[PDB]
């Protein structure tokens, strides 16, 4: 009659064996079955590689007059509670769900034996909502917050005002063109500082809430620069608090990682996936691409339109940096010639900047794009794409900025003609003077031309590289280079910016049809004919662009993000579900 | 001269209708695969057209890349006749 | 209901005398296109690996520069 305790850590004498993790016996059982599952999926198994490079043709081909709208089995799982999942109606789903780390699919019978191929669930947020509902996730996050003794320094008010930032349909698209012109460069922001000092000031005056929260590098420049009393104190306070939550949460995760090392490198990249550098942030302005080829002991493959880029010894062949703008003064006209007389389809070159060797482990951008903005705002944004030549003709063929003898400190609304900038600035209703629009014109010397999407293909870490299918050991991911991400649009915005922006629903948190159907009138009919596709969990996305099974974030992450109430408990749950399911992750979880 | 019939199941003699002697055809998926592969074929129709202009311009650029070292060689080989 | 043709060895295909002659010509025009693309990208890789030979030979010739 003693009270023998039974924690988690006593169970790690059997929860860390590899025979929990090798599905070879499971696939040898499922392939040697006398009867396979009859209903097949064939929607987003393999990321087929696009031969072209521009992302507008992929989107406009994937959604013209499309009638058959499938849905994956992973979105079929997380669309129903626990009880009916265990009901015998859904034996066609329970024939597959048979391992907590592997969601085995059947694929196609293209060859002879349709083999049960098994992709791996990396993080614990990939568990289906029937077997782990949202309440369990947020209560687990509440255990996590007192596990690391976190000090959540954001109130409710910042979360709800950044929530109705994205839920505002009247977001000024002038902020989109300002972000598309700046696109995360320090020396570029030192140009347009008194511009955004006027923009977010008149937006804070306009509707109470704040703007420009749709980019990490932008709010990072807001916290770093621009505290010089140009904005009101309450507007700067929201940005500084949002910057503070990320570094507090990352100190919390680094507390969860503890003080242990494997080999010589630390263990933070094995237990949590945010501290894993091989996860990539979904917006890449700066160079990060050479960095994860240099720091990863595992072997990643940066796939840009069936170009492998497996080694950094042929690194400048695939990607060139633009560096600072003052280096390129001998190459301005050469870059313009590569703009105009360069066939950008069948062009596998990437135009980026430098890899800033910042003290934030390419991870502050990662944590803000993956834990905050999809959960304070319920994953209700889509990745748009810009054409920089079109915004340059927008921002420099106008009247007053071209003359250079119309002076600086005057109105721009009176003296410009009725171009796209005119009605773009009407519905925005801000008054940026002439001259501070001139550096927006001036950045075009060193902006790139297109919003290319690169499907990065990183291999898994050492803990779960036990799949028998060697091409299925790795977990693919896409990242929309050189474009920002955008909140809700109006039809008035689409009527003036149909020549400017095109949506790319590329990520799990960032492929949302309720926003992408506004600014892109091909999916607007696709959801009009198939109205069930409007949930973020089940929306069709291009398999040549985004592979739903081969992804770090499956459908239940989006389901939780779209149904969590935006508050502190939801944030702590969302950073609680980014923890991987390694045995080392189990060890660093049972320590805490 | 064929015949028409609804169904049967599980034979041993071969030429008897069954449920395993039915070819398993889904019409909509095959039409979808056929249409998308026609468009891949139609893109493959227009591919080997104008790399000859790229061949002539690459001959031009290797010409202008040889002419620079042709300029450099005799100039580098005249700066050795001042040593006496 | 739905009616299925009975399995017998006197069942006919839908007779095709004319649709095979143009067929292999379209096949040859497609496969020459594919083989030319494969040889083009192959020669692209071949010039890429051949150019590093002359870069190595240039850095081998540069030894005589280093004492001059």
């Amino acid at each position: 009659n003693l009270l023998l305790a039974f924690n988690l850590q006593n169970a790690l004498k059997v929860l860390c064996h590899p025979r929990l993790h090798t599905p070879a016996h499971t696939l040898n059982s499922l392939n040697a079955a006398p009867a396979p599952r009859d209903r097949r999926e064939t929607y987003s198994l393999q990321h087929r590689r696009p031969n072209h490079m521009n992302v507008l043709v992929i989107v406009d081909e994937f959604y013209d007059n499309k009638y058959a709208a499938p849905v994956t089995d992973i979105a079929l799982k997380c669309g129903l509670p626990t009880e009916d999942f265990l009901h015998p109606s859904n034996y066609d789903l329970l024939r597959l769900e048979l391992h907590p780390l592997y969601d085995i699919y059947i694929g196609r019978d293209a060859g002879e034996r349709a083999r049960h191929r098994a992709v791996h669930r990396l993080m614990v947020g990939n568990l289906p909502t029937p077997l782990a509902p949202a309440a369990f996730q947020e209560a687990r996050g509440q255990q996590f917050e007192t596990a690391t003794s976190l000090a959540h320094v954001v109130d409710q008010a910042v979360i709800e005002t950044v929530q109705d930032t994205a839920y505002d349909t009247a977001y000024p698209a002038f902020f989109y063109v300002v972000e598309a012109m700046i696109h995360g460069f320090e020396e570029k922001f030192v140009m347009n500082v008194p511009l955004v000092s006027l923009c977010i000031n008149t937006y804070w005056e306009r509707s109470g809430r704040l703007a420009f929260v749709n980019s990490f590098s932008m709010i990072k420049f807001i916290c770093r620069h621009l505290g010089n009393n140009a904005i009101s104190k309450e507007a700067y306070s929201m940005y500084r608090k949002i910057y503070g939550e990320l570094i507090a949460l990352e100190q919390a995760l680094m507390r969860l990682a503890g003080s242990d090392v494997v080999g010589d490198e630390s263990v933070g990249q094995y237990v949590c996936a945010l501290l894993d550098p091989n996860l990539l942030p979904p917006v890449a302005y700066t160079d990060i691409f050479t960095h994860l080829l240099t720091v990863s002991d595992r072997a990643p493959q940066i796939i840009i339109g069936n170009e492998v880029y497996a080694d950094t010894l042929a690194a400048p062949q695939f990607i060139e940096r633009v560096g600072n703008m003052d280096e390129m003064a001998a190459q301005f006209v050469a870059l313009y010639g590569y703009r105009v007389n360069g066939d950008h389809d069948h062009d596998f070159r990437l135009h980026l900047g430098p890899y800033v060797d910042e003290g934030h482990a390419d991870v502050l951008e990662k944590i803000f794009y993956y834990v905050f903005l999809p959960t304070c705002t319920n994953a209700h944004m889509c990745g748009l794409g810009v054409d920089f030549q079109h915004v340059a003709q927008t921002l420099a063929y106008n009247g007053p900025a071209f003359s250079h003898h119309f002076t600086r400190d005057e109105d721009i609304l009176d003296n410009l003609e009725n171009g796209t900038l005119r009605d773009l600035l009407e519905i925005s209703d801000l008054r940026p003077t002439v001259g501070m629009i001139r550096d927006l014109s001036a950045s075009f010397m060193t902006c790139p031309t297109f919003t290319r999407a690169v499907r990065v293909s990183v291999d898994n870490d050492v803990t779960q590289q036990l799949a028998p299918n060697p091409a299925d050991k790795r977990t693919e991911q896409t990242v929309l280079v050189n474009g920002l991400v955008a909140f809700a649009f109006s039809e008035r915005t689409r009527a003036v910016t149909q020549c400017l922006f095109h949506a790319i629903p590329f990520h799990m948190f960032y492929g949302d049809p309720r926003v992408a159907a506004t600014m892109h009138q091909d999916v607007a009919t696709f959801v009009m004919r198939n109205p069930q596709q409007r949930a973020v969990e089940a929306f069709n996305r291009p398999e040549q662009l985004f592979a739903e099974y081969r992804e770090w974030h499956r459908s239940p992450m989006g389901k939780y993000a779209a149904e969590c109430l935006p508050s502190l408990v939801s944030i702590s749950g969302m950073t609680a579900m980014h923890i991987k399911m390694s045995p080392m992750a189990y060890i660093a979880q049972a320590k805490l | 001269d064929p015949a028409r019939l609804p169904r049967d199941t599980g034979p041993e003699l071969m030429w008897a209708p069954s449920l395993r002697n039915s070819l398993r055809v889904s019409p909509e998926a095959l039409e979808l695969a056929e249409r998308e592969a026609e468009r891949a074929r139609s893109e493959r129709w227009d591919r080997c057209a104008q790399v000859l202009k790229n061949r002539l311009l690459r001959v031009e650029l290797d010409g202008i890349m040889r002419d620079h070292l042709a300029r450099a060689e005799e100039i580098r080989q005249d700066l050795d006749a001042v040593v006496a | 209901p739905e009616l299925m043709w009975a399995p017998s060895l006197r069942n006919s295909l839908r007779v095709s005398p004319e649709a095979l002659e143009l067929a292999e010509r379209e096949a040859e025009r497609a496969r020459s296109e594919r083989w030319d693309r494969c040889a083009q990208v192959l020669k692209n890789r071949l010039l890429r690996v051949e150019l590093d030979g002359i870069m190595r030979d240039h850095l081998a010739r540069a030894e005589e520069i280093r004492q001059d």
């Binding site: 062949q317 | 790229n54 450099a72 700066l79 | 520069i65």
Partner: peptide, 29 residues
């Protein structure tokens, strides 16, 4: 003895310009 410096930095600069033009080829194709 000023003939072993200026012409030498000249040929070094041209030996870098030819690698720059090979990189310009790799920019082209």
């Amino acid at each position: 003895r000023f003939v072993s410096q200026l012409r030498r930095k000249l040929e070094r600069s041209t030996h870098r310009l030819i690698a720059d033009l090979e990189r310009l080829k790799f920019l082209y194709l």
